[PDB]
Design a protein around this motif. Structure first.
Motif, mmCIF file in Angstrom:
data_model
loop_
_atom_site.group_PDB
_atom_site.id
_atom_site.type_symbol
_atom_site.label_atom_id
_atom_site.label_comp_id
_atom_site.label_asym_id
_atom_site.label_seq_id
_atom_site.Cartn_x
_atom_site.Cartn_y
_atom_site.Cartn_z
ATOM 1 N N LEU A 181 0.822 -1.224 0.000
ATOM 2 C CA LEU A 181 0.000 0.000 0.000
ATOM 3 C C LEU A 181 0.853 1.269 0.000
ATOM 4 O O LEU A 181 0.690 2.137 -0.876
ATOM 5 C CB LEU A 181 -1.008 0.054 1.183
ATOM 6 C CG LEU A 181 -2.125 -1.005 1.263
ATOM 7 C CD1 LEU A 181 -2.959 -0.768 2.440
ATOM 8 C CD2 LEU A 181 -3.059 -0.958 0.077
ATOM 9 N N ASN A 230 4.243 1.765 -0.603
ATOM 10 C CA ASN A 230 5.306 1.917 -1.596
ATOM 11 C C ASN A 230 4.962 1.523 -3.046
ATOM 12 O O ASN A 230 5.840 1.674 -3.897
ATOM 13 C CB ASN A 230 6.544 1.169 -1.120
ATOM 14 C CG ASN A 230 6.950 1.543 0.289
ATOM 15 O OD1 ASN A 230 7.549 2.593 0.525
ATOM 16 N ND2 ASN A 230 6.610 0.703 1.262
ATOM 17 N N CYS A 231 3.709 1.108 -3.364
ATOM 18 C CA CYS A 231 3.381 0.791 -4.763
ATOM 19 C C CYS A 231 3.189 2.047 -5.597
ATOM 20 O O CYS A 231 3.242 1.978 -6.825
ATOM 21 C CB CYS A 231 2.197 -0.161 -4.891
ATOM 22 S SG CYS A 231 0.573 0.631 -4.763
ATOM 23 N N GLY A 232 2.956 3.170 -4.916
ATOM 24 C CA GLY A 232 2.811 4.475 -5.542
ATOM 25 C C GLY A 232 1.423 4.845 -6.008
ATOM 26 O O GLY A 232 1.264 5.850 -6.710
ATOM 27 N N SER A 233 0.413 4.046 -5.641
ATOM 28 C CA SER A 233 -0.973 4.348 -6.013
ATOM 29 C C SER A 233 -1.667 5.104 -4.880
ATOM 30 O O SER A 233 -2.681 5.765 -5.120
ATOM 31 C CB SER A 233 -1.758 3.077 -6.350
ATOM 32 O OG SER A 233 -1.327 2.464 -7.553
ATOM 33 N N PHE A 234 -1.118 5.025 -3.652
ATOM 34 C CA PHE A 234 -1.749 5.642 -2.490
ATOM 35 C C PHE A 234 -0.899 6.633 -1.764
ATOM 36 O O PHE A 234 0.290 6.368 -1.540
ATOM 37 C CB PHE A 234 -2.093 4.572 -1.456
ATOM 38 C CG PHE A 234 -2.863 3.378 -1.931
ATOM 39 C CD1 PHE A 234 -2.204 2.253 -2.404
ATOM 40 C CD2 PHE A 234 -4.239 3.339 -1.818
ATOM 41 C CE1 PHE A 234 -2.911 1.137 -2.823
ATOM 42 C CE2 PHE A 234 -4.946 2.212 -2.210
ATOM 43 C CZ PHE A 234 -4.276 1.117 -2.713
ATOM 44 N N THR A 235 -1.554 7.687 -1.232
ATOM 45 C CA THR A 235 -0.942 8.686 -0.350
ATOM 46 C C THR A 235 -0.737 7.985 0.997
ATOM 47 O O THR A 235 -1.311 6.906 1.194
ATOM 48 C CB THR A 235 -1.850 9.918 -0.203
ATOM 49 O OG1 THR A 235 -2.944 9.634 0.665
ATOM 50 C CG2 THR A 235 -2.376 10.427 -1.528
ATOM 51 N N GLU A 244 -4.198 7.622 2.731
ATOM 52 C CA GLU A 244 -4.974 6.576 2.048
ATOM 53 C C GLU A 244 -4.526 5.191 2.504
ATOM 54 O O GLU A 244 -5.376 4.386 2.876
ATOM 55 C CB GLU A 244 -4.850 6.689 0.515
ATOM 56 C CG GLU A 244 -5.626 7.838 -0.114
ATOM 57 C CD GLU A 244 -5.307 8.192 -1.562
ATOM 58 O OE1 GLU A 244 -4.312 7.667 -2.115
ATOM 59 O OE2 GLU A 244 -6.040 9.033 -2.132
ATOM 60 N N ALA A 245 -3.198 4.930 2.505
ATOM 61 C CA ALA A 245 -2.655 3.648 2.901
ATOM 62 C C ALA A 245 -2.983 3.338 4.352
ATOM 63 O O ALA A 245 -3.440 2.229 4.659
ATOM 64 C CB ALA A 245 -1.165 3.613 2.672
ATOM 65 N N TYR A 254 -6.878 2.612 4.812
ATOM 66 C CA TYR A 254 -7.232 1.285 4.333
ATOM 67 C C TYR A 254 -6.906 0.222 5.326
ATOM 68 O O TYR A 254 -7.746 -0.669 5.509
ATOM 69 C CB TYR A 254 -6.660 0.968 2.942
ATOM 70 C CG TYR A 254 -7.593 1.453 1.860
ATOM 71 C CD1 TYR A 254 -8.878 0.934 1.737
ATOM 72 C CD2 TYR A 254 -7.234 2.504 1.023
ATOM 73 C CE1 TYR A 254 -9.784 1.449 0.814
ATOM 74 C CE2 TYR A 254 -8.123 3.012 0.076
ATOM 75 C CZ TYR A 254 -9.403 2.487 -0.019
ATOM 76 O OH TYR A 254 -10.296 2.982 -0.944
#
Ligand SMILES: CC(C)(COP(=O)(O)OP(=O)(O)OC[C@H]1O[C@@H](n2cnc3c(N)ncnc32)[C@H](O)[C@@H]1OP(=O)(O)O)[C@@H](O)C(=O)NCCC(=O)NCCS
Ligand SMILES: CC(C)(COP(=O)(O)OP(=O)(O)OC[C@H]1O[C@@H](n2cnc3c(N)ncnc32)[C@H](O)[C@@H]1OP(=O)(O)O)[C@@H](O)C(=O)NCCC(=O)NCCS
Ligand SMILES: Nc1ncnc2c1ncn2[C@@H]1O[C@H](COP(=O)(O)OP(=O)(O)O)[C@@H](O)[C@H]1O
Ligand SMILES: O=P([O-])(O)O
Ligand SMILES: [Mg+2]
Ligand SMILES: [Mg+2]
Lengths: 1035, 177, 94
Positions: free
Chosen positions: B117, B119-124, B127-128, B131
């Motif tokens: 969550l 470090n994949c770069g899709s979430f702030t 956000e991470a 979740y």
């Protein structure tokens, strides 16, 4: 234990941590040289090497270097290189040790006078530590024990600097007294804080410029690593000079250090034909002794042991090491493996032997090739089962294995293997009223104690409560005969003590890390008068503090590193004696007239067996533990036994090293000990005169000849003690004594009364295959019991290796089949299209309502899933069933359409709200196209599409919908993929596999909604009244 | 549906909880800046065991295959794994106590998921962290295990297994008098 | 467990004082009579079945079937003597 460290390691820690007003000169000025030294790199790190003249000497635990001309003094770096040219890599003989000169140390040359050389030493003993000081230091110091000023710093005592000045620094020059006092004071704190057991500086040089540490000789308490790891760092313990270390030795050392179990291994002769894998430190010695005594000294390959209940895996890793080592080269007469041990107390024999059996199976090829013959003799917990597995591996592999139990004398297999014999302070500690608290979660130990108590015909159980800090207060179920009882478990010891004032004994199962503090805490409750410390591995220093407090508080310590003791008919400390079967076998339910004391816990259990067979039995027996300073010593207990009227004779199982056994000679001489004493000191070997070369000047003298087992055995026999020929005669001499005492009326043996009966444990009866009980449950999808997880016959690693995917895994768990790739991909496709369909649907709605009502994921999901089945989500199953029936019945599509109309039924999987024959459903398009492309045959889909041709010709929106499409496609996949019989395919449909697809699929959508509502921070829902038609009865 | 839900309703605390628990525990410790050794001792003092540490048989020398499979994929494909690195360092300490105190699959998934969550770069970060808190990790276990449970349901029906009644011998009746 | 049943009989004799003489299978059934009276001192097809015979049990008789199967095992038979069972109230199962 206490292990020696290099002069470099020592000087590093010294320079780093010594806190003193005294300016210590040449701090960190030292460089290490090996045959692999890069001189350019060395000079980059140590530029001071060119600043002044140097001194070079080897750092290989070689004592008296200077006297051997192994110290190059006052040389330039060029001169040092020239000095090392003939020495580095050369072989050298220091006394009776021959090895290579591999490691050297360069230091700056310190110009000083002989008057300016001093001697300091600090070393631990039971009573505290001694600080020695002499003003005539140097390579000509001599017997420092008599010459130097001694000073004892008591146990929890501080080194007062006035005492240093007053007594140690008496003959030191007056002007240097303040600097020396400041240094010695600081040194003492450094010695203390880093857990040294011995630290010696000779010479210590004090000039107009300051203090210089010219030489270090120190030993640390290796067991204290858990504390000091931070300060110590990557501390290496060098092997003594001449002895060349093996990678196998280093491996086992690592296993031992990372576990509560004891795993030791030392190679004697790698090319020897006699290999030993003995359980217990006591037994290991006794076996080594027996081999030496039968001439095998030159053929003995190793001395090691495994104890403290190691896991099957640890035992396997240990065994593979021995087996690897003995299959390196062939011997003309083949080889022998002695898998011995005494009768175990807690090491589970069935369990440990399974590890060994695994290693034998892996090395069966080399073992047969090297003509290896195995001899096994072991007793203890589930020995019966472990002995069976040994006999069985011998048959299945072809390796000759001779298995023996408790009925065989411990050392009998040695003569068998060599082919000499054919192969066939308080006196009373416990009462019948004693109640104890067990610190730790030890269910088997407690039950063991309680079974001993019931057979001893005790009126109450010996365990009153348990203390386990991780759980909240609760009660644990136990057995009092066949009656279930509850024992209280406390989070806090304070509560246990308060609720149980009757308790006077504490059994401490705390780990070496937790042990000190828990014992120290117990001592604050005056009710506790005896503490048994089980833990092996408590730093010597912390134990000395426990002894000091227990001594001043009158509390008797049994341990550390003990199994405990046993008083037949009264009390048994935790696991002493082992399982009931051993308690009954060695008749420990009733007392005798023989009292014993041993260091080894394992040998204590063998002694119970010996004494029971030769005499009227054990009165009381104690294992004092194996740590350097035990809480209670041999003499302490011998005197208790001398003062107990019921004791008619005493048996002492001594050991090599120490002088404790001599206190007995002295006691007899003095007339204090009048009762007959039988004694054997184990360790009659070291016939291989290793003669561990004295560590420094302080220890070097004493008399290491008197410490020996051969010397002690002679001394004791002359003293009047009854000493056997060898351990194998110990039974005979004890029997000989007992027979004279009965003959002289000192012993009046009592008639034998049968003990109360206790039922066999189900677990045990099932292990021996005595009873059968049918399983209530039946499974066939997954097996978690193995080394690896198995999904329907396929191990988890294969699942990933074969790239099965979610679809593949579902095939195994749901159908227990390896499906074709197209089938798996199709299942995944179904799960994707069924994932979600908005929040308006019955299930989504409930999940949202639920999430909004503040519930958790599982509650919210279930609330929604519970709507799936009939009017919502039913269609998949319904369509598949309907169409299959119609197809299989042989009716043509038009006949089917009309049949349904006549019966007043709508076709399941036909119809759509908006989608028509001109405006198609994309999900149906996606799926139809995949199936057409990859399914070998699709007869039911073909039939269904023909039905669709008829219905769309009625109303255009009467299209085959996604529920119908999946239904028929799935049936075609089961029937035509070739993994299932017709019966199998038809059963899967019927039992509702298709419902499973929708449920699993939509579960994703529902979790999606739950998270969404939580993320959207949506409040509680209340349905508006305007949407509700209230039609209640008239009053 | 009834059979599946009956089973799913046990998921949450003592059964299936560990993934969420491990993720939360390790995240807290890491984010607080305490070093792995400080963490191990803090837990001991507080009288708490580490979530996602320990195994019945599997040890440092005999690894858990599920953990091996996952650990290897994660190292190979994830750009950064700071929390996994931290957890593995905690494992170095615990295995040095008892060899079976390994990082288990619940702990592995927990910390790997947090790393995914973050470090994949899709979430702030926000956000991470939301979740994790709202229980995305519980969802993974629930969805995952739902397959196994449906598996068992089908199996019992296929095995034509009769009604279960627990034997009285296994029940200790401790009623009032 | 006749051995233990004979134990309770012997014990009630001792505790009450009533003379009770207890005997097992080792004594001939009618030997106690002579003892009591004081005459003797108190101390179609020929073959029906083969080792290959297979049967169907009509009814739900679990104990009887298991009994047969234990006899078969102990007789060192290669296969069990019960091939199937017939019970009209349940559906086909194993
Ligand atoms: C001492 C002995 C009774 C118990 O040792 P053990 O099983 O290794 O110890 P524990 O059960 O307390 O567990 C070890 C540690 O793991 C920790 N631990 C366990 N599960 C954990 C988890 N999930 N998370 C974090 N820590 C965990 C415990 O807190 C404990 O910590 P500590 O050592 O700081 O107290 C045992 O080693 C023994 O029988 N030794 C034999 C000694 C001997 O030879 N005796 C003499 C006969 S001669
Ligand atoms: C007469 C009129 C008012 C209604 O016609 P309509 O909406 O097409 O008719 P229906 O609602 O009865 O449905 C048409 C057919 O679809 C069938 N049908 C609907 N859903 C179906 C389903 N899921 N499965 C099978 N058949 C289905 C009905 O049985 C009906 O069959 P029929 O024509 O043999 O009676 C209209 O045609 C008109 O306005 N005419 C001028
Ligand atoms: N750095 C040094 N500067 C001056 N003299 C030294 C130095 N190192 C050693 N010496 C001298 O060499 C002698 C022998 O060295 P030492 O370290 O004591 O070895 P050992 O006692 O094992 O023979 C010392 O007693 C001392 O006189
Ligand atoms: O290891 P032992 O000698 O205590 O049995
Ligand atoms: Mg010296
Ligand atoms: Mg031991």
């Amino acid at each position: 234990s206490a292990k020696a460290i290099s002069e470099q390691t020592g000087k590093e820690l010294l320079y780093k941590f010594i806190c003193t007003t005294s300016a210590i000169q040449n701090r960190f000025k030292y460089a290490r040289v090996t045959p692999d030294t890069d001189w350019a790199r060395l000079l980059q790190d140590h530029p001071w090497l060119l600043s002044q003249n140097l001194v070079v000497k080897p750092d290989q635990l070689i004592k008296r270097r200077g006297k051997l001309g192994l110290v190059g003094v006052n040389l330039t770096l060029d001169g040092v290189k020239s000095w090392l040219k003939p020495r580095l890599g050369q072989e050298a003989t220091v006394g009776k040790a021959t090895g290579f000169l591999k490691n050297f140390l360069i230091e700056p040359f310190v110009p000083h006078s002989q008057a300016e050389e001093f001697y300091v030493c600090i070393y631990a003993t039971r009573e505290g530590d001694y600080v020695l000081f002499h003003h005539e230091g140097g390579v000509d110091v001599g017997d420092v024990d008599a010459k130097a000023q001694k000073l004892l710093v008591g146990v929890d005592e501080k080194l007062n600097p006035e005492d240093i000045k007053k007594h140690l620094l008496v003959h030191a020059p007056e002007d240097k007294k303040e600097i020396l006092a400041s240094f010695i004071s600081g040194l003492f704190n450094f010695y203390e804080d880093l857990y040294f057991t011995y630290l010696e500086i000779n010479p210590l040089v004090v000039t107009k410029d300051g203090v210089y540490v010219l030489d270090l000789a120190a030993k640390v308490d290796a067991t204290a690593d858990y504390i000091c790891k931070v300060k110590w760092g990557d501390i290496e313990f060098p092997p003594p000079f001449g002895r060349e270390a093996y990678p196998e030795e280093a491996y086992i050392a690592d296993l031992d250090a990372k576990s509560g179990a004891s795993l030791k291994l030392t190679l004697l002769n790698p090319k020897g034909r006699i290999w030993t894998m003995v359980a217990g430190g006591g037994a290991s010695v006794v076996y080594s002794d027996t081999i030496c005594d039968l001439g095998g000294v030159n053929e003995l390959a190793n001395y090691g042991e495994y104890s403290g209940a190691p896991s099957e895996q640890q035992t396997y890793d240990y065994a593979k090491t021995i087996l690897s080592l003995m299959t390196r080269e062939k011997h003309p007469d083949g080889k022998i493996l002695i898998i011995g041990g005494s009768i175990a107390n807690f090491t589970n024999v069935a369990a440990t032997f399974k590890g060994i059996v695994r290693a034998i199976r892996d090395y069966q090829g080399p073992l047969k090739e090297h003509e290896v013959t195995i001899f096994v003799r072991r007793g203890g917990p589930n020995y019966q089962e472990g002995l069976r597995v040994m006999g069985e591996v011998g048959k299945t592999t072809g390796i000759p294995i001779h298995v023996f139990g408790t009925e065989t004398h411990m050392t009998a297999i040695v003569g068998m293997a060599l082919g000499h014999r054919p192969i066939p302070k308080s006196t009373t500690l416990f009462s019948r009223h004693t109640k104890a608290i067990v610190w730790g979660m030890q269910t088997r130990a407690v039950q063991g104690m309680l079974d001993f108590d019931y057979v001893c015909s005790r009126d109450e159980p010996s365990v009153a409560a348990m203390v386990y800090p991780f759980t909240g207060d609760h009660k644990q179920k136990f057995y009092w005969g066949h009656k279930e009882i509850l024992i209280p478990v406390f989070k806090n010891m304070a509560d246990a003590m308060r609720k149980h004032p009757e308790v006077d004994v504490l059994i401490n199962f705390a780990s070496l890390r937790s042990a000190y503090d828990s014992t120290m805490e117990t001592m604050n409750y005056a009710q506790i008068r005896t503490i048994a410390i089980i833990a092996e591995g408590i730093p010597e220093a912390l134990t000395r503090k426990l002894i000091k407090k227990a001594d001043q508080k009158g509390v008797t310590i049994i341990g550390p590193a003990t199994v405990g003791g046993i008083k037949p008919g009264c009390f048994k400390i935790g696991n002493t004696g082992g399982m009931l079967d051993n308690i009954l076998a060695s008749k420990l339910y009733r007392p005798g007239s023989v009292a014993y004391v041993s260091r080894s816990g394992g040998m204590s259990n063998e002694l119970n067996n010996i004494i029971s067979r030769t005499t009227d039995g054990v009165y009381e027996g104690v294992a004092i533990g194996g740590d350097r300073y035990p809480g209670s010593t041999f003499m302490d207990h011998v005197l208790r036994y001398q003062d107990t009227p019921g004791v008619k004779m005493i048996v002492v199982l001594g050991e090599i090293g120490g002088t404790e056994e001599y206190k007995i000679c002295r006691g007899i001489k003095e007339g204090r000990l009048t009762k007959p004493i039988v004694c054997w000191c184990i360790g009659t070997c070291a016939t291989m005169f290793s003669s561990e070369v004295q560590f420094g000047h302080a220890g070097a003298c004493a008399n290491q000849a008197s410490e020996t087992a051969v010397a002690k055995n002679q001394a004791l026999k002359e003293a009047g003690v009854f000493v056997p020929r060898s351990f194998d005669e110990l039974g005979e001499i004890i029997q000989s004594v007992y027979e004279d005492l009965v003959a002289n009326g000192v012993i009046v043996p009592a008639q034998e009364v049968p003990p109360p009966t206790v039922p066999m444990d189900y677990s045990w009866a099932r292990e021996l295959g005595l009873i059968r009980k049918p399983a209530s449950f039946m499974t066939s999808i997954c097996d978690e019991r193995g080394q690896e997880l198995i999904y329907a016959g396929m191990p988890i690693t294969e699942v990933f290796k074969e790239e099965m995917g979610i679809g593949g895994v579902l095939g195994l768990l749901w159908f227990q089949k390896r499906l074709p790739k197209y089938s798996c991909q199709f299942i995944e496709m179904c799960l994707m299209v069924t994932a979600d369909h908005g929040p308006a649907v019955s299930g989504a709605h409930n999940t949202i309502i639920c999430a909004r009502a503040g519930k958790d994921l599982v509650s919210s999901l279930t609330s929604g899933l519970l709507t799936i089945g009939d009017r919502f989500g039913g269609a998949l199953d319904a369509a598949a069933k309907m169409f299959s029936k119609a197809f299989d019945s042989g009716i043509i599509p038009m006949e089917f359409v009309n049949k349904m109309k006549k019966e007043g039924k709508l076709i399941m999987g036909i119809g759509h709200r908006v989608k028509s024959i001109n405006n198609p459903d994309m999900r149906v398009q996606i799926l139809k196209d995949y199936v057409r492309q990859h399914f070998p045959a699709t007869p039911l889909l073909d039939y269904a599409l023909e039905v669709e041709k008829i219905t769309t010709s009625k109303k255009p929106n009467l299209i085959l919908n996604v529920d119908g499409l999946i239904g028929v496609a799935f049936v075609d996949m089961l029937r035509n993929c070739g993994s299932f019989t017709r019966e199998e395919a038809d059963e899967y449909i019927d039992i509702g596999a298709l419902n499973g697809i929708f449920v699993l699929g939509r579960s994703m959508g529902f979790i999606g909604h739950y998270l969404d509502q939580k993320r959207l921070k949506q409040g509680l829902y209340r349905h508006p009244w305007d949407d509700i038609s209230y039609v209640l009865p008239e009053h």
